[PDB]
Amino acid sequence: LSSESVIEQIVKYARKGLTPSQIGVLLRDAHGVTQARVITGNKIMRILKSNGLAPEIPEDLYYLIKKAVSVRKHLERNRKDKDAKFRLILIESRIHRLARYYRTVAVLPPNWKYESATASALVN
Amino acid sequence: ESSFMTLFPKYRESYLKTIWNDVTRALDKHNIACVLDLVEGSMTVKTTRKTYDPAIILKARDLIKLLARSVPFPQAVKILQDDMACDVIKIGNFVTNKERFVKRRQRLVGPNGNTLKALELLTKCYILVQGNTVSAMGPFKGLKEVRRVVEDCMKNIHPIYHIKELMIKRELAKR
Amino acid sequence: NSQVFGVARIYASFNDTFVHVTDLSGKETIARVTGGMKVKADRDESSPYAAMLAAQDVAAKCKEVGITAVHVKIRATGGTRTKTPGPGGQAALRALARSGLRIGRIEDVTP
RNA sequence: AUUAAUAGGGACGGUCGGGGGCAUCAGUAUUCAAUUGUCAGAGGUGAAAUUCUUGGAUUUAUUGAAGACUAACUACUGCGAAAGCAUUUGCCAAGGACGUUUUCAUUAAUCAAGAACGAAAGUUAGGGGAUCGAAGAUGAUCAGAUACCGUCGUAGUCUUAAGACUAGGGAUCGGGUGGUGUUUUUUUA
Numbered sequence: 001l002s003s004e005s006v007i008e009q010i011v012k013y014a015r016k017g018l019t020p021s022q023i024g025v026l027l028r029d030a031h032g033v034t035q036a037r038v039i040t041g042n043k044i045m046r047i048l049k050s051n052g053l054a055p056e057i058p059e060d061l062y063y064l065i066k067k068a069v070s071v072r073k074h075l076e077r078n079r080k081d082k083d084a085k086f087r088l089i090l091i092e093s094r095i096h097r098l099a100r101y102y103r104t105v106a107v108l109p110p111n112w113k114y115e116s117a118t119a120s121a122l123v124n
Numbered sequence: 125e126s127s128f129m130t131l132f133p134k135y136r137e138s139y140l141k142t143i144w145n146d147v148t149r150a151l152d153k154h155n156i157a158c159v160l161d162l163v164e165g166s167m168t169v170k171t172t173r174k175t176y177d178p179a180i181i182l183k184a185r186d187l188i189k190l191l192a193r194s195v196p197f198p199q200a201v202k203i204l205q206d207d208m209a210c211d212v213i214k215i216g217n218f219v220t221n222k223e224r225f226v227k228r229r230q231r232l233v234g235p236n237g238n239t240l241k242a243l244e245l246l247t248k249c250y251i252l253v254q255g256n257t258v259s260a261m262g263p264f265k266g267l268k269e270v271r272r273v274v275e276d277c278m279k280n281i282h283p284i285y286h287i288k289e290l291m292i293k294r295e296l297a298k299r
Numbered sequence: 300n301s302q303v304f305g306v307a308r309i310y311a312s313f314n315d316t317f318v319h320v321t322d323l324s325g326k327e328t329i330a331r332v333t334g335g336m337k338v339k340a341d342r343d344e345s346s347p348y349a350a351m352l353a354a355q356d357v358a359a360k361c362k363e364v365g366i367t368a369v370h371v372k373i374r375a376t377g378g379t380r381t382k383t384p385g386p387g388g389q390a391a392l393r394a395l396a397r398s399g400l401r402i403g404r405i406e407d408v409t410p
Numbered sequence: 411a412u413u414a415a416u417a418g419g420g421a422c423g424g425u426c427g428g429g430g431g432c433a434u435c436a437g438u439a440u441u442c443a444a445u446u447g448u449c450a451g452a453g454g455u456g457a458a459a460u461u462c463u464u465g466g467a468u469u470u471a472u473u474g475a476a477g478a479c480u481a482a483c484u485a486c487u488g489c490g491a492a493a494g495c496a497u498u499u500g501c502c503a504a505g506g507a508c509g510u511u512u513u514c515a516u517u518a519a520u521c522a523a524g525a526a527c528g529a530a531a532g533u534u535a536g537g538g539g540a541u542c543g544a545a546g547a548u549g550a551u552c553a554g555a556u557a558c559c560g561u562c563g564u565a566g567u568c569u570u571a572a573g574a575c576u577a578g579g580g581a582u583c584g585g586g587u588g589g590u591g592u593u594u595u596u597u598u599a
Contacts, residue, residue, distance in 0.1 A: 019420085019421065019513070020421095020512085020513060020514080021420085021421045021422070021510090021512055021513040021514095022421080022422075022512085022513090023512085023513095024510090024511090024512040024513080025421090025422060025423090025510075025512050025513095026512095027512080028510075028511080028512055029512090034511065035511035035512080036511075036512085037414090037511050038511065042411085043411075043514085043515095044512085044513080044514075045514065045515095046411055049411090050411090058419095058420095058514060058515085058516065058517075059419085059420075059421095059513055059514035059515085059516095059517090060418085060419045060420060060421095060513070060514055060515080060516070060517040061419085061420080061514090061516085061517055062420075063420040063421080063513095064419070064420045064517060065420090065517095066420080067420065067504095070503075070504090071503065071504070072503085073502090073503055074431070074502075074503035074504075075503080075526095077431090077502095077503080078431070078432090078503095079526090080431090080527085081430085081431060081503075082491060082492070082493090082526055082527050083429090083430060083431085083490090083491050083492070083503085083504080083505095083527095084430090084431080084491085084503045084504065085491080085526060085527090086491035086492080086526060086527090087491065087503070087504060087505085088503090089491075089525085089526075090491070091504095094419080094420090094517075095517065095518085096418070096419070096517050096518080097417085097418055097419075097516070097517050097518060097519090098418075098419085098515075098516035098517050098518060099516075099517065099518060100518040101515095101516055101517090101518055102515095102516050102517090102518090103518085105515085105516060107514095107515080107516055108516085
């Protein structure tokens with residue numbers, strides 16, 4: 001087995017308003033299914049974008065920018081907390097590998113202009 | 125009466141048990157209940173009524189401090205006489221960096237040991253640095269200036285000039 | 300022991316010493332041994348001769364007060380000092396043995 | 411809907427810092443006002459001089475004001491955007507092992523100018539001391555503004571100081587396996 005039922009369960013769990021990691025871990029620990037990379041042969045967001053369940057930002061940049069906005073919460077509460085203030089700078093370094101790679105790989109728009117100021121709007 | 129008790133290190137109880145025979149045979153005659161509580165990891169001594177002098181409790185307290193300093197116990201517990209002072213100076217609260225503490229310990233050791241222990245031998249001190257503390261035994265007049273020079277060498281300044289000044293003061297002591 | 304007892308709080312240093320005559324409370328106003336009033340030569344006070352000389356008059360006034368047993372409270376300078384006395388502790392112990400004071404409740408009041 | 415160095419990453423639960431931010435909990439030694447065993451000698455102490463001297467000075471028959479820090483146990487066993495971190499609590503940016511087929515393939519590589527702390531006596535006295543210079547000038551009151559907004563000289567501005575070893579012999583270090591018991595690790599290989 002029922003590979004289409006596993007694909008239907010993946011689409012239903014992606015439409016439940018939860019993260020896809022918690023969607024698949026619940027499938028891998030409570031349903032006994034193998035994988036999306038198993039012989040069903042369709043990826044996680046590939047099934048979700050075909051079913052219209054994909055998110056706006058990517059799976060490694062949406063809540064990562066939310067953690068970037070949250071890393072400056074102690075910096076705003078105390079400017080002397082230079083460990084947290086540079087952790088938010090390191091959260092700007094958590095913008096780490098592939099956005100300008102997506103400027104040529106066509107995943108995000110090149111005029112998106114991702115930054116920590118707009119990360120508060122992209123957090124939720 | 126009361127008692128003096130203190131806990132010791134891991135290798136201190138193994139070292140003290142090798143000389144605990146004659147130590148307890150003299151302490152019990154001098155009304156000191158010198159025993160090694162291996163279950164609690166401590167050494168205690170109770171002041172009994174079989175002492176002909178009141179300095180036995182003070183000497184056993186100095187001997188317990190010398191035994192717990194991870195130094196040679198038979199060479200540091202014989203300071204029960206009046207003209208024999210044994211004390212330990214904690215030099216660990218002088219530096220913060222480990223590399224600076226290692227560099228200061230090498231200067232305190234000196235080149236091959238005897239380059240910095242010559243002033244200790246000139247001041248007649250059986251100095252032995254163990255971890256964060258250094259224990260020395262000898263005359264009180266010779267160890268008071270030695271511990272002050274040790275505190276000066278434990279400062280952030282370089283102890284090479286302090287060791288040279290200590291050798292100069294030892295050479296000037298001949299007069 | 301018919302309550303004939305006291306306490307000696309000996310605050311001693313490398314070159315000086317002092318004696319506080321105490322009960323369990325602050326009572327038993329017996330005497331107080333000076334440091335260098337027995338001999339003024341800046342080396343005899345460090346020696347045990349001057350400390351025992353002051354302790355001889357201190358123990359005579361202690362017998363006048365009526366305190367026989369002495370509860371030792373050995374106090375040093377402590378802190379940034381050497382935290383140890385000179386020969387005053389051995390001289391007071393020798394004076395206690397010469398006077399025949401009862402040994403009991405001996406403690407160290409060093410800081 | 412070929413690529414997965416599982417080039418790399420929100421995640422995922424068990425378990426953690428003397429990293430660190432507060433939150434209470436102990437006080438180890440000092441200062442003054444207390445105030446005395448009505449002690450004038452006590453620091454220093456090449457012997458000295460020299461600091462405080464009969465204004466109480468070891469102290470005290472302990473109240474407060476404050477800072478202060480983990481003693482034999484003990485000790486780098488560890489943990490740092492970083493200028494560093496040693497009892498006892500409740501909270502948090504975040505940091506932490508690991509597995510994942512579960513997070514996605516797309517979270518640019520070095521970075522100087524732009525930003526974050528930014529440290530081994532922030533010591534001494536003359537000189538140009540000019541551009542300017544806090545500390546305070548003085549204008550409009552705004553129920554409220556040393557800066558809101560013009561007008562001046564001082565530490566400053568800058569130098570003056572603390573063997574062709576011919577050979578053996580046992581021990582030593584680094585290993586490993588025969589067997590031996592626990593440790594390693596008992597899935598975090």
